[PDB]
Amino acid sequence: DFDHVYSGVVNLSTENIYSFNYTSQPDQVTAVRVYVNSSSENLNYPVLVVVRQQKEVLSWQVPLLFQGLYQRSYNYQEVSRTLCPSEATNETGPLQQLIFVDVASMAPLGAQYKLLVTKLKHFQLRTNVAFHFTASPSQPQYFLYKFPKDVDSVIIKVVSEMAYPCSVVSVQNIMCPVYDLDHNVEFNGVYQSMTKKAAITLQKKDFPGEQFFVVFVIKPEDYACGGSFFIQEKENQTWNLQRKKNLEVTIVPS
Amino acid sequence: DFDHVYSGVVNLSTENIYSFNYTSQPDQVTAVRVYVNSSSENLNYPVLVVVRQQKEVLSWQVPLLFQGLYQRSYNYQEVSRTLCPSEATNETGPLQQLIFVDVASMAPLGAQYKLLVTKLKHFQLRTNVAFHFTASPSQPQYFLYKFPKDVDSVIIKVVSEMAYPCSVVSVQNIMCPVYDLDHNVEFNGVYQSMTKKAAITLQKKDFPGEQFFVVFVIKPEDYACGGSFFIQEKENQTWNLQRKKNLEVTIVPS
Ligand SMILES: *[C@@H]1O[C@H](CO)[C@@H](O)[C@H](O)[C@H]1NC(C)=O
Ligand SMILES: *[C@@H]1O[C@H](CO)[C@@H](O)[C@H](O)[C@H]1NC(C)=O
Ligand SMILES: *[C@@H]1O[C@H](CO)[C@@H](O)[C@H](O)[C@H]1NC(C)=O
Ligand SMILES: *[C@@H]1O[C@H](CO)[C@@H](O)[C@H](O)[C@H]1NC(C)=O
Ligand SMILES: *[C@@H]1O[C@H](CO)[C@@H](O)[C@H](O)[C@H]1NC(C)=O
Ligand SMILES: *[C@@H]1O[C@H](CO)[C@@H](O)[C@H](O)[C@H]1NC(C)=O
């Protein structure tokens, strides 16, 4: 059941399996959202969490580890990701899709974890309607925009209040898996880094499906955006664990 | 047990689990190699294969699907990958490491799969000793090179016979996971595309661990290397299923 937070313990011998079932009616897209965290401060035994779809498998390790420049390590405890939104057409049918969440680890004593699942109520961006959302290095986001019939070009405008952390806004076509990671978001489509403002101009003629994904991914450090670095004698920067950035996104017709 | 090919059937209700255990003595690196293939020609239900380590989880889908330019799809049946090589130091101990291989799917009838596991006998490249190996878009490779005490710079030279397919040779530091995919290999470290020849100059001063990984990844198409494209009316190019490239690698002291 969505909108519920399960709590559990993991260890070498026991793994937890939760099967979710849901339907997506035609002309409406429903993106699933997974909200995991683990309280294990240790890094030699991170808890692995996998989400399996009908076609795609996505796995990650918690607490997520980042290796910035100058060999500083970062340990993030809250991780989150959005799955491939299965698309339905005028070929109707209540597609009774299923999604597995499997958690396991090999910690000698174990590790705590809390897991929440929820469909994104606002997944399809609307024209000229400003939306507010909070991102984070380990909590990337993305939403689907569908072009209108009359409009032939759009400008997507993103505004933030606090300049740091550095962030990246990308636009890709609809062919999942969706590239929403710091080391991979740059491979495909358009993208740009930003602190306060960003704007991408898109034409429907370059997108055969007349609908595209917009992905927001926050960097772990701020070197690429000209930021500074707090020199700390501790390699594991436990202070950099709650990085967040408020964001407003609006798509205006060109 | 390594050097053995297991055969099995997968479906919605049944999954297969095989736990492997092995040890890596200090000053010797042992990289595990996973050799999977599936005979399911269908693409709406690919079989998912995951490999779980003590810290890292790596998952892929078979038959692997590639989306080149001009919306041509490719279906590769043989997939393979090398895991994170756990490193042991003068702090001795026969590290009795374990690695899980879990296979599952939801095909309405099922899908065949054959799985083989083996340690790489030649994983640490030797100076001035030429090595021969066969790569492929879905079968990437990588090996570890360790700098000598006297030598301070090296040149790695790669030579192939057949110009196509296009390939990429990358060098990264030792901090796994190792970036050995077409959309990600370009993120970190040095790399270059090639058809027949390539050469990377490296200094030990830029590598704190005085040892680096060398990754060979073959592209699915040849557009980036100036190759042509066989125009076919079939979107699923079943002919492009056995792409291979013989390769010779030699590290000379600068
Ligand atoms: C979802 O699908 C599974 C198997 O496909 C089934 O066992 C389960 O009952 C379904 N959920 C609902 C609410 O019917
Ligand atoms: C973990 O996340 C859940 C919801 O995602 C939240 O209720 C809980 O407080 C979080 N735990 C910690 C320790 O932050
Ligand atoms: C068929 O497609 C059109 C345009 O995409 C849409 O307006 C209409 O609602 C669809 N029909 C049904 C029954 O959903
Ligand atoms: C490998 O480790 C597992 C559990 O850690 C153990 O059950 C198994 O016996 C080990 N393998 C060997 C050959 O001892
Ligand atoms: C699958 O791979 C195994 C070894 O990796 C090999 O023996 C077998 O012939 C392969 N099957 C097919 C259909 O290629
Ligand atoms: C200790 O390290 C040195 C250099 O790395 C190596 O030659 C030696 O064999 C190591 N000692 C043991 C007991 O492995």
Author numbering:
A (entry chain B), B (entry chain A): 47 to 300
Question: What do the authors say?
Answer:
Human SIDT1 and SIDT2 are closely related members of the SID-1 transmembrane family, and have been implicated in various biological processes such as glucose and lipid metabolism, innate immunity, and tumorigenesis. Here, we present the cryo-electron microscopy (cryo-EM) structures of human SIDT1 and SIDT2. Both structures reveal an overall architecture of a dimeric arrangement composed of an extracellular domain (ECD) rich in β-strands and a transmembrane domain (TMD) with 11 passes, highlighting the remarkable structural congruence. Importantly, the ECDs of SIDT1 and SIDT2 bind synthetic plant-derived miRNA only under acidic conditions.
The SIDT1 ECD consists of two subdomains, ECD1 and ECD2, connected by a flexible loop. A disulfide bond between C130 of ECD1 and C222 of ECD2, along with another pair of disulfide bonds between C212 and C271 on ECD2, contributes to the stability of SIDT1. Bioinformatics analysis predicted eight N-glycosylation sites in SIDT1, with three glycosylation sites resolved in the EM map. The dimer interface of the SIDT1 ECD can be divided into two regions. The first region involves hydrophobic interactions between ECD1 subdomains of two protomers, supported by hydrogen bond interactions. A conserved hydrogen bond between S105 residues is observed in SIDT1, corresponding to S92 in SIDT2. The second region involves a long loop on ECD2, connecting two β-strand sheets, with a potential hydrogen bond between H229 and N230. In addition, Q113 in SIDT1 may maintain a hydrogen bond interaction with N219 from the other protomer instead of the ionic bond interaction observed between R100 and D204 in SIDT2. In the SIDT2 ECD model, the dimerization interaction involves a buried surface area of ~1700 Å2 from each protomer, in contrast to ~1300 Å2 in the SIDT1 model, indicating differences in the proximity of the formed homodimers between SIDT1 and SIDT2, probably due to sequence variations. Sedimentation velocity analytical ultracentrifugation (SV-AUC) analysis further confirmed that SIDT1ECD exists as a monomer, with a sedimentation coefficient of 2.8 S and a molecular weight of ~44.6 kDa, while SIDT2ECD forms a dimer with a sedimentation coefficient of 4.8 S and a molecular weight of ~74.2 kDa.
